[PDB]
């Protein structure tokens, strides 16, 4: 258990290194790997069920996990210029993430200013 949290913290850190310094695409891939945040469907709630269970160390970290996601998600999905462009994904991801954030704002520091980054 102790080691597991350890690796998670390291993974999150590598995500940080690559978050900024560009590499928007890479950040999403890694964050998803964490298996903390709902990329799939409305499984956002399962992410609720598995949230309280979370160890104290991680439970604290989630705030940044979200908003990192809505950032890369934003910047990467800068509306492009002028073909296959599936904007839909990396869009659904924000949606699931927001539902997630919506469900646990009380158990979070109190910055659903995801909204600011969310829109434009």
């Amino acid at each position: 258990f102790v080691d597991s949290t350890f690796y998670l913290l390291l993974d999150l850190i590598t995500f940080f290194d690559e978050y900024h310094s560009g590499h928007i695409d890479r950040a999403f891939d890694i964050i998803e790997r964490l298996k903390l945040v709902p990329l799939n469907q409305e499984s956002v709630e399962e992410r609720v069920a598995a949230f309280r269970n979370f160890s104290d160390e991680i439970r604290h970290n989630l705030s940044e996990v979200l908003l990192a996601t809505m950032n890369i998600l934003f910047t990467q999905f800068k509306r492009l210029k002028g073909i296959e462009d599936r904007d839909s994904q990396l869009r659904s991801q924000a949606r699931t993430l927001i539902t997630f954030a919506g469900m646990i704002p009380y158990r979070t520091s109190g910055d659903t200013n995801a909204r600011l980054v969310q829109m434009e």
């Binding site: 409305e42 709630e45 539902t99 919506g102």
Partner: protein, 202 residues
């Protein structure tokens, strides 16, 4: 009559070649305007033409008679139907012109940024037919909010529009709830998706 002929000439000189535009504004009225409108467009006068059409619509009606007519919505003379039928023709002209535009923005904002609650309601109705409805979310107009509200009960699209429209959580949730409760066939999966959404807004 003669005045109308003069107006056509007024524009006609303008067809050949700011002033004639102004001269037209003075003259503007009725059906002959339709032909005349095509002429205004020739020298890319879309924006001015819309205000033109709108002002004309208001000029005949002054004012607000049609609104009363709609309230009753009676086929009888009620307030007089004639005003309503007349304006719609002008409105259709405005919409017809809008379509031709497709410097797009300057033309549109003019229409929206005008004070005419039948016009905007009509515009929206025009937009829905086009399936322009998503664009509707964008429209800032103060007229828009009442439009959605009144229309609220393929209205579902209007409502999908509405809850989305409400940035505010409370208002959005109240709508989805009604959406779920609603008597039009909507699958439970959606009914629940509405609730899942509505609940999230908690």
């Amino acid at each position: 009559d003669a005045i109308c002929s003069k107006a056509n000439e007024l524009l006609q000189r303008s067809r050949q070649v700011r002033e004639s535009l102004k001269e037209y504004q003075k003259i503007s009225n009725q059906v002959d305007l339709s032909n005349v409108c095509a002429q205004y467009r020739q020298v890319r006068f879309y924006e001015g033409v819309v205000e033109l059409s709108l002002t004309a619509a208001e000029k005949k009606d002054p004012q607000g008679l049609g609104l009363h007519f709609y309230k009753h919505g009676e086929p009888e003379e009620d307030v007089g139907l004639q005003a309503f039928q007349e304006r719609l023709n002008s409105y259709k002209c405005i919409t017809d012109t809008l379509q031709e535009l497709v410097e797009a923005g300057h033309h549109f904002e003019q229409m929206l940024k005008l004070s005419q609650r039948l016009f905007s309601i009509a515009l929206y109705n025009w937009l829905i037919q086009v399936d322009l409805a998503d664009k509707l979310l964008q429209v800032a107009s103060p007229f828009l909010e009442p439009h959605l509200v009144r229309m609220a009960k393929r209205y579902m699209d209007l409502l999908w529009r509405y809850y989305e429209k409400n940035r505010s959580f409370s208002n959005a949730a109240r709508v989805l709830s009604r959406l779920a409760d609603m008597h039009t066939e909507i699958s439970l999966q959606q009914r629940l998706e509405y609730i899942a959404r509505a609940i999230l807004s908690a």
